[PDB]
Design a protein around this ligand. Structure first.
Ligand code: MG
Ligand code: MG
Ligand code: MG
Ligand code: MG
Ligand code: MG
Ligand code: MG
Ligand code: MG
Ligand code: MG
Ligand code: MG
Ligand code: MG
Ligand code: MG
Ligand code: MG
Ligand code: MG
Ligand code: MG
Ligand code: MG
Ligand code: MG
Ligand code: ZN
Ligand code: ZN
Ligand code: ZN
Lengths: 232, 135, 81, 104, 91, 97
RNA sequence: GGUGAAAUUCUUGGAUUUAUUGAAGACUAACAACUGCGAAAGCAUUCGCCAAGGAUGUUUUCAUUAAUCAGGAACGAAAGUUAGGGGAUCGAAGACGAUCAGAUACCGUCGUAGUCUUAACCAUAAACUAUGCCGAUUAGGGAUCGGACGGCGUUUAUUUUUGA
């Protein structure tokens, strides 16, 4: 509302002179790492480089949310969005690397339903490359076609047995791996198939998934690895 | 003035519309929160405080958002819906749909519907007391 | 119903009720002779044994205790004596 | 006099239950006593489906769903016309109401 | 043959300094004159010498502890947590 | 190692043992001991001295997991004890392990 | 910002909003039910350690060892008290903005004790199933949690027996 301001600019002020800050902006391209199919993911904006304020420093700590469906050109993985962290900005060419993964919220509420049992676990792990990262997991009980009984509930003893089997399998699989190998296992959801094959005997546990992955620490920049993954 | 690109391809942005039960905010960025393309709210456009959250006010705000972002070169938007969250209502306000429709009708492109309402895993005690608002 | 001879219930009805709810209590457990594959000896084992029973020769296990009646080794056969 | 066999709470066999907050007036009520409603709805109302469909950039698109679980105290239950007064004989009937499947 | 109703050891102060102050001093004084079992030899002869020094009358060992007690809950919890942290981290 | 508490009681009731340090040392000198027990909080010099004699005599030694107070009360006696020797087993099977 | 509607309050000394990072305390949504455990009060994030308990199974063991209790004793929500630590959020007392003829209230912005924990007191609640404890008999039905027993099949694995 126009007629509510009382102090306006405050105790004492004066109008501005120069406006329209968009005359000094620049547009940059964004790339993607090696395993993904498409590399261009959009455009980004930043102020033009000037004295006392370099542009490259402002484009080294940005994060981006990109759905995995766009990266893989496939509508099956339309419920996962991942984070990408910018590291080095080549001329008119931003280079990026992995920064995380996460499911969409709406699918998780569509999975959560009454009168069944949900199994959940998490675990921290470190790779051969000195990355400290944490994993989340999800599973649900499976209905049987000929059941007449209304409810499907599991006993806590098997619940903890499943939790132990999940933790041991995930730790064994993620014990000795690199980022390129693990992501090459993430996009086809390899981990789930071993979880289900190991656990069918105790109880079915349909909808095995890795909820999210987040990293805590990183080693030195190691530009050689970034240039190894980029520019194919 | 704008990013050079061929006519066939189109560039993406993201709009974060916050629709509570007292006011609505429309904010457009560039697929990241570092840069804000434009922002307008119901309050300046409307002439009465109560009407700031009306669907009509949200549609009017969406029209001049599309007008302001058209010359920047951006041609398509993703939307990120969020409610009050936390201890709030978690139900989007009345001016959500209005502005969303006005954005679609103005000619803009739409993709990647999403809801970003913040939900706690286990929240603190909520305002009001043991007897609630007794009116 | 309304006319039954309670003195002489049917054998199925007395083999079907709980072991203490019959006219006179009677155990529903038994002894058995097990054929050990390795040797030719004979051991008498309770059907509901609470302890692991060891055979005299070659020292092999015969059963594992459980909540009800002990479970026998897979490569074994028995007859109820 | 007893008006209801279950004391209008549905709690027999235990001593205490953790309370919850009403979604309207922020009152505290036992979880088993509050009225719980589960709702599934669309992102946009049915008239806007075409506008989203032809304004999308993915040819055919399927709008996602929205899932909420609201919970009210009894004071908020019959003021919002969620539930209504029944007769003395009709009180003892816990079958869900038959939703209309023809709509004339 | 109890000679007191509730005052206890702090009866040497007569009718001075107030009941609350006598109760507070008595509660802390009672634990300072008692005897504690030695952790090394096992005999029940360990007594306070200085403000933070306790010594055993049998094996003649002397140990530094709290003001009025051989050990403090904070120090015990810190020794236990440090032992747990070290053994998990290095083993 | 909870079983050893019950196992020792049978040896006490059936066989014959000698308690204390001087008597165990004299038995170990005699060379007719079969197993020696040592408490947790005995002085380290005493520990190594006893182990050195056991090593010379080729007899097993067991390190009890508790102090001498419960070592003493684990034998039905009302006094502390730090070390002991098994002169002979009774009907028990201590020497099996 | 918030309301049936306003104002108190914060704002180009850049409010509100957007993205990244850090710190602090409290709490464990959805799953969660005419479902579980405990003498009751009460008990919901993972894992490790310690002792305890009910039910089932049993051709193990003792042999009346038992039922209720005047006085007596242990426990006993919330609030409250005495000494330390901690103090994010709400919020008794209190200070403002509105409504009203008045409003020391209901509505809105702040806010002390308290809300958490350690060592000790207090012993009262619509502490309700408004229904004392032990023992025997009395009508039909279908659900459901734990243990044991019988059976036709399906699923599945270094696969049988087990688990569903
Ligand atoms: Mg408003
Ligand atoms: Mg009213
Ligand atoms: Mg009960
Ligand atoms: Mg109660
Ligand atoms: Mg700002
Ligand atoms: Mg939980
Ligand atoms: Mg349960
Ligand atoms: Mg009495
Ligand atoms: Mg209390
Ligand atoms: Mg204090
Ligand atoms: Mg108030
Ligand atoms: Mg406040
Ligand atoms: Mg308190
Ligand atoms: Mg009373
Ligand atoms: Mg009673
Ligand atoms: Mg069976
Ligand atoms: Zn044999
Ligand atoms: Zn309410
Ligand atoms: Zn000593």
């Amino acid at each position: 509302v126009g007629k509510n301001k009382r102090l306006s600019k405050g105790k004492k002020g004066l109008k501005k002179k120069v406006q329209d800050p968009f005359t000094r902006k620049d547009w940059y391209n964004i790339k993607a790492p090696a395993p993904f199919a498409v590399r261009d993911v959009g455009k980004t904006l930043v102020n033009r480089t000037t004295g006392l304020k370099n542009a490259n420093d402002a484009l080294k700590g940005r994060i981006f949310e990109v759905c995995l469906a766009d990266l893989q050109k496939d509508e099956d993985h339309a419920f996962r969005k991942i984070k990408l962290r910018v590291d080095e900005v080549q001329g008119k060419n931003c280079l990026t690397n992995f920064h995380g993964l996460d499911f969409t919220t709406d699918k998780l509420r569509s999975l959560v339903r009454k009168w069944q049992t949900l199994i959940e676990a998490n675990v921290t792990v470190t790779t051969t490359d000195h990355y400290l990262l944490r994993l989340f997991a999800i599973a649900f009980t499976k209905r049987r076609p000929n059941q007449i009984k209304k409810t499907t509930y599991a006993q806590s003893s098997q619940i903890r047995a499943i939790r132990r089997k999940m933790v041991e399998i995930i730790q064994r699989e993620a014990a000795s791996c690199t980022l390129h190998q693990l992501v090459s296992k993430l996009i086809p959801e390899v981990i789930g198939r071993e979880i289900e094959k190991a656990t069918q005997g105790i109880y079915p546990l349909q909808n095995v998934h890795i909820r999210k992955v987040k990293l805590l620490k990183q080693p030195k920049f190691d530009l050689g690895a970034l240039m190894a993954l980029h520019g194919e | 003035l704008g990013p050079q690109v061929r006519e066939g391809e189109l560039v993406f942005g993201v709009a974060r519309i916050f629709a509570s039960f007292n006011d609505t905010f429309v904010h457009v960025t560039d697929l990241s929160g570092r840069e804000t393309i434009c922002r307008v709210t119901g309050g300046m456009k409307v002439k009465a405080d109560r009407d700031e959250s009306s669907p009509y006010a949200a549609m009017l705000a969406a029209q001049d958002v599309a007008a302001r972002c058209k010359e920047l070169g951006i041609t398509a938007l993703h939307i990120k819906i969020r409610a009050t969250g936390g201890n709030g209502t978690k139900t989007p306000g009345p001016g959500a749909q209005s502005a969303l429709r006005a954005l679609a009708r103005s000619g803009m492109k739409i993709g990647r519907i999403e809801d970003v309402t913040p939900t706690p895993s286990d929240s603190t005690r909520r305002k009001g007391g043991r007897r609630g608002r007794r009116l | 119903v309304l006319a039954v001879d309670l003195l002489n219930p049917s054998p199925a009805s007395e083999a079907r009720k709980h072991k203490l709810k019959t006219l006179v209590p009677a155990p529903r457990s038994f002894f058995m002779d097990v054929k050990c594959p390795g040797c030719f000896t004979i051991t008498t084992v309770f059907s509901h044994a609470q302890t692991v029973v060891i055979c005299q020769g070659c020292t092999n296990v015969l059963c594992q205790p459980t909540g009800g009646k002990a479970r026998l080794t897979e490569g074994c056969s028995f007859r109820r004596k | 006099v007893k008006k209801r066999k279950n004391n209008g709470r549905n709690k027999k066999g235990r001593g205490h239950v953790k309370p919850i907050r009403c979604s309207n007036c922020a009152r505290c009520t036992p979880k088993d006593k509050a009225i719980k409603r589960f709702t599934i709805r669309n992102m946009v109302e049915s008239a806007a489906i075409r506008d989203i469909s032809d304004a999308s950039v993915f040819a055919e698109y399927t709008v996602p769903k929205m899932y909420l679980k609201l919970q009210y105290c009894v004071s908020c239950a019959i003021h919002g016309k969620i539930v209504r007064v029944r007769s003395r004989e009709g009180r003892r009937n816990r079958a869900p109401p038959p939703r209309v499947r023809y709509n004339k | 043959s109890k000679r007191t109703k509730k005052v206890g050891i702090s009866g040497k102060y007569g009718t001075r300094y107030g009941a609350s102050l006598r109760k507070l001093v008595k509660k802390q004084e009672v634990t300072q004159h008692a005897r504690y079992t030695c952790t090394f030899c096992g005999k029940n002869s360990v007594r306070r010498t200085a403000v933070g020094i306790w010594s055993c009358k049998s094996c003649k060992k002397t140990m530094a502890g709290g003001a009025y007690t051989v050990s403090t809950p904070a120090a015990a919890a810190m020794r236990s947590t440090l032992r747990r942290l070290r053994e998990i981290t290095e083993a | 190692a909870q079983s050893i508490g019950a196992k020792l009681a049978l040896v006490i009731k059936s066989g014959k043992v000698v308690l204390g340090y001087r008597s165990t040392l004299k038995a170990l000198r005699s060379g007719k001991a079969k197993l020696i027990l040592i408490a947790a909080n005995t002085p380290p010099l005493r520990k190594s001295e006893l182990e050195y004699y056991s090593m010379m005599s080729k007899t097993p030694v067991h390190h009890y997991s508790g102090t001498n107070i419960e070592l003493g009360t684990a034998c039905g006696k009302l006094f502390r004890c730090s070390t002991m020797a098994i002169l002979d087993a009774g009907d028990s099977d201590i020497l099996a392990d």
